[PDB]
């Protein structure tokens, strides 16, 4: 099936806990895969205009590890619940992808999760201004704008609203698309 095929591809890139104990400032992100209308989509947040770090930017759900978290996957799931109302029974964590090093002292660990078909996002307005889906296939043929820094522009055909996706967030979206969609019979 579509979903079994995606998880099988993803597992081949799982690094597991290999880099998890190193002495960094630690953050996790959840890359949430949603199936709709026979295709896979990624779920993105727009950060509230009132936040300290990067107000109004497009990001995946995530945040800083705290002492309660059993592991890095737990960080991602706790944060996703707080931001968009995703409960643990509503997500299957499939793997841990290559981590992102920043600022010489920070390590960000990305997890890919498959989302239940009955999940409906409840944006927490203290943290998130908006939540939206993008088809995974978009990231194979994006609409690119050069700011040089490459920026993706996605327009939602339901309402005509355009979102800008850039940086680590855009890079991780492309990676997931390549892993799942490369070399497929039509």
Ligand X SMILES: CC[C@@H](C(=O)Nc1ccon1)c1ccccc1
Q: How far is CA 112 from CA 105, 130, 136, 144, 173, in A?
A: 24, 21, 13, 25, 11
83 is in an annotated binding site: yes
Among 31, 43, 59, 73, binds ligand X (CB under 6 A): 59
- Classify the phi-psi angles of 123: left when phi > 0, otherwise alpha if psi is within -120 to 50, otherwise beta: beta
Cα separation of 7 and 22, whole Å? 27
Among 73, 83, 94, 109, binds ligand X (CB under 6 A): 83
Take residue 59 and report the two structure tokens written for it: 């990001």
Nearer to ligand X (CB atom), residue 9 or residue 47:
47
Among 69, 71, 116, 127, binds ligand X (CB under 6 A): 127
Cα separation of 10 and 12, whole Å? 5
Breaks (C-N over 2.5 A) in the chain follow: 147
Among 6, 29, 73, 91, binds ligand X (CB under 6 A): 29
Q: Does 62 interact with ligand X (rule: CB under 6 A)? A: yes
Q: Smallest distance, Å, CB 22 to ligand X?
A: 17
Contact segment (CB under 6 A) with ligand X among 34-42, 55-63, 111-119, 138-146 equals 55-63
Q: Does 44 interact with ligand X (rule: CB under 6 A)? A: no
Among 40, 43, 63, 96, binds ligand X (CB under 6 A): 63
Q: Smallest distance, Å, CB 150 to ligand X?
A: 16
Q: How far is CA 66 from CA 52, 137, 144, 176, in A?
A: 18, 34, 36, 27
Footprint of ligand X on this chain (CB under 6 A)?
27, 29, 45, 47, 59-63, 83, 127-128, 168-169
């Amino acid at each position: 099936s579509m979903l079994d095929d995606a998880k099988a591809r993803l597992r081949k890139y799982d690094i597991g806990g290999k880099y998890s104990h190193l002495p960094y400032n630690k953050y996790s992100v959840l890359l949430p895969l949603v199936a709709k209308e026979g295709k896979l989509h990624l779920l993105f947040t727009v950060r509230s205009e009132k936040l300290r770090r990067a107000p109004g930017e497009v990001c995946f759900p995530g945040g800083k590890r705290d002492p309660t978290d059993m592991d890095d996957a737990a960080t991602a799931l706790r944060e996703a619940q707080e931001e968009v109302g995703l409960r643990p029974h509503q997500v299957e964590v499939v793997c841990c992808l290559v981590p992102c090093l920043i600022d010489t002292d920070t390590l960000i660990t990305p997890f890919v999760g498959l989302i239940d078909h009955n999940f409906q996002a409840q944006p927490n307005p203290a943290e998130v201004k908006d939540v939206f889906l993008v088809p995974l296939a978009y990231f194979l043929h994006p609409q690119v704008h050069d700011q040089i820094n490459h920026i993706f522009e996605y327009t939602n055909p339901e309402d005509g609203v355009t979102y800008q996706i850039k940086g680590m967030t855009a890079n991780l979206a492309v990676l997931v698309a390549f892993i799942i969609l490369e070399k497929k019979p039509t």
